[PDB]
Design a protein around this ligand. Structure first.
Ligand SMILES: *[C@@H]1O[C@H](CO)[C@@H](O[C@@H]2O[C@H](CO)[C@@H](O)[C@H](O)[C@H]2NC(C)=O)[C@H](O)[C@H]1NC(C)=O
Ligand SMILES: *[C@@H]1O[C@H](CO)[C@@H](O[C@@H]2O[C@H](CO)[C@@H](O)[C@H](O)[C@H]2NC(C)=O)[C@H](O)[C@H]1NC(C)=O
Ligand SMILES: *[C@@H]1O[C@H](CO)[C@@H](O)[C@H](O)[C@H]1NC(C)=O
Ligand SMILES: *[C@@H]1O[C@H](CO)[C@@H](O)[C@H](O)[C@H]1NC(C)=O
Ligand SMILES: *[C@@H]1O[C@H](CO)[C@@H](O)[C@H](O)[C@H]1NC(C)=O
Ligand SMILES: *[C@@H]1O[C@H](CO)[C@@H](O)[C@H](O)[C@H]1NC(C)=O
Ligand SMILES: *[C@@H]1O[C@H](CO)[C@@H](O)[C@H](O)[C@H]1NC(C)=O
Ligand SMILES: *[C@@H]1O[C@H](CO)[C@@H](O)[C@H](O)[C@H]1NC(C)=O
Ligand SMILES: *[C@@H]1O[C@H](CO)[C@@H](O)[C@H](O)[C@H]1NC(C)=O
Ligand SMILES: *[C@@H]1O[C@H](CO)[C@@H](O)[C@H](O)[C@H]1NC(C)=O
Lengths: 98, 172, 98, 172
């Protein structure tokens, strides 16, 4: 009754659409050659995510910041060593079911 | 052709636990349409006076008896509000759906004709001012569909010691 | 150099495989009839997730707890009203790339 | 058939900035295989004594000169450790791969023959005791592949004011 509607509403609140820290696979994020390793392979950024209460509505970003991160890229064969690369990743700052 | 009641008003203010008895009398054999049952004696007493009469009476009247009362043989309608203190609010409960037609009405029925009352949910509170969203004592509040789509459930909030009805919401 | 390896290592640390709060769509989680709405439609639980440094290795649970949650289920047509249902959801408590 | 040096030892302890000069003398015309260049005079001086001689000399010797020294015409090998204080550690740097063969060796070369030294990374520190993982002054430490698969990078840690080499790791 009371307490159950309370908790249920809390579950809704807790499960609502919003930006969340996720691990993005860099290679898969820019779609590079199948001969590259990234180190680290993934980066933690915030992206819009969660569940909408309709199906035809999908959680999308309405505003995005950009984060500079630096990591290393190994190519094959080992012609050269790991080179430093600077990359900008999306950091979603607001979301809406659209 | 149209019949008439013993009380020519479209809105009666009654208190709970008060005995209510009205005579609908007009021409043809008549029959009341008072919502439900029971504990209320239904006796069709003729009177002549220039018409056939029919009286409706009820001794024990509380909240679960407030509603509309029609005496159809050109029908004759009259609404009656029965004021209760324990349960001023009547829920569905848990019955609410909607179709995209810009018209989404909430069925949260009010015991008292004049109240300052607001509808609240998970998505803040929704104040009625009359242009986009409008309150109506007859049954509840009226809201446009695509704006309330954002909310998942709804619950009417009052100003008294507070009382909260609780229907839900499913969009189409 | 120094500070860059430092940060990179921090990115790795931050992006490592572990249990994370996610929103699970209940209907889709048990695979119910395409005529049911769940309220709320989704629940927040922790599931093993993140990125492995190999491809053939995939983040899986090595131990799971179970959480009782109660919510409402609407069926169609509106023959009856929403009924209370108790459901157990997996709460992953440890993970390994397998 | 096999030649011989002016110093019959498989391991020489030298300090940095110290001038080093050894005579490999044995039979046929010979040639040293000292790692790289330069600032070290290469002169093949005969001596007869019962063989043709060849001397290798070097005035400025630091860390980037420590290594193995062979005089092949049955070869004649001798390793020389040149102790430095500023840069006791030599990295690849950033060169490390592996194939699944249970043998994964780390190339972090040590200036000093006897050290207590441990390899650390993101996944705690890895202590060498000799059965599963084993340390070797000649070049570095030996670890089985499927256990180090869990780690992403590696860096040798010492006990002195600390020094950290830094290769990486990519599995196959
Ligand atoms: C990256 O996105 C996150 C969003 O998760 C930002 O963190 C905060 O997000 C909340 C949303 O609830 C905002 O109200 C805050 O203003 C954000 N910053 C903080 C910590 O106060 C984060 O700022 C974003 N990073 C950037 C600058 O790109
Ligand atoms: C559900 O899973 C989470 C895991 O995210 C549990 O929360 C804590 O997880 C950390 C892992 O870093 C453990 O060390 C803690 O022991 C966990 N509990 C806390 C808050 O101390 C959570 O306990 C799980 N819920 C249950 C009991 O099923
Ligand atoms: C999200 O929306 C903003 C709106 O300006 C856009 O700039 C950004 O590129 C979007 N994020 C995506 C799709 O990567
Ligand atoms: C008839 O109606 C009047 C109100 O107009 C009411 O006061 C009276 O009690 C009714 N008579 C009965 C009980 O039939
Ligand atoms: C209203 O309806 C129910 C029907 O069983 C009844 O039990 C309840 O007591 C009624 N409310 C009153 C008279 O206060
Ligand atoms: C209800 O609110 C309205 C707002 O204008 C106010 O005028 C009225 O007096 C209120 N009713 C009360 C508190 O009696
Ligand atoms: C995760 O692993 C545990 C091991 O006991 C198992 O009981 C649990 O069912 C697994 N979680 C899944 C696959 O839902
Ligand atoms: C020959 O070797 C000895 C060590 O055995 C060394 O002390 C000496 O300097 C060398 N002679 C030279 C410089 O040719
Ligand atoms: C070692 O090698 C590099 C090669 O350019 C040289 O510049 C450096 O000074 C050397 N280290 C010494 C002699 O301390
Ligand atoms: C290095 O560690 C070993 C551990 O047994 C110890 O015996 C030895 O004395 C240490 N070397 C030092 C501190 O001189």
């Amino acid at each position: 009754n009371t307490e159950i509607l309370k908790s249920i509403d809390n579950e809704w609140r807790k499960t609502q659409c919003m930006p969340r820290e996720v691990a993005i696979d860099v290679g898969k994020e820019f779609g590079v050659a199948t001969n590259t390793f990234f180190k680290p392979p993934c980066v933690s950024v915030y992206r819009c995510g969660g569940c909408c209460n309709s199906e035809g509505l999908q959680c999308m970003n309405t505003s995005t910041s950009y984060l500079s991160k630096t990591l290393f890229e190994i190519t094959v064969p080992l012609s050269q060593g790991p080179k430093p690369v600077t990359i900008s990743f999306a950091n979603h700052t607001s979301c809406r079911c659209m | 052709t149209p019949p008439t009641l013993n009380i020519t008003e479209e809105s009666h203010v009654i208190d709970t636990g008060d005995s209510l008895s009205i005579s609908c009398r007009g021409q043809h054999p008549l029959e009341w349409a008072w919502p439900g049952a029971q504990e209320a004696p239904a006796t069709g007493d003729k009177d002549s006076e220039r018409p056939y009469c029919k009286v409706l009476l009820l001794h024990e009247v509380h909240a679960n008896d407030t509603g509309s009362y029609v005496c159809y043989y050109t029908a004759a309608s009259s609404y009656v509000f029965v004021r209760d203190f324990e349960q001023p609010f009547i829920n569905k409960p848990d019955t609410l759906l909607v179709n995209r037609k810009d018209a989404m009405w909430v069925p949260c029925l009010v015991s008292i004709p004049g109240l300052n009352v607001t509808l609240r949910s998970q998505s803040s509170v929704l104040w009625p001012d009359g242009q986009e969203v409008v309150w109506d004592d007859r049954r509840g509040m009226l809201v446009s569909t695509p704006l309330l789509h954002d909310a998942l459930y709804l619950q009417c909030e009052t100003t008294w010691q507070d009382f909260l009805s609780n229907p839900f919401l499913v969009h189409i």
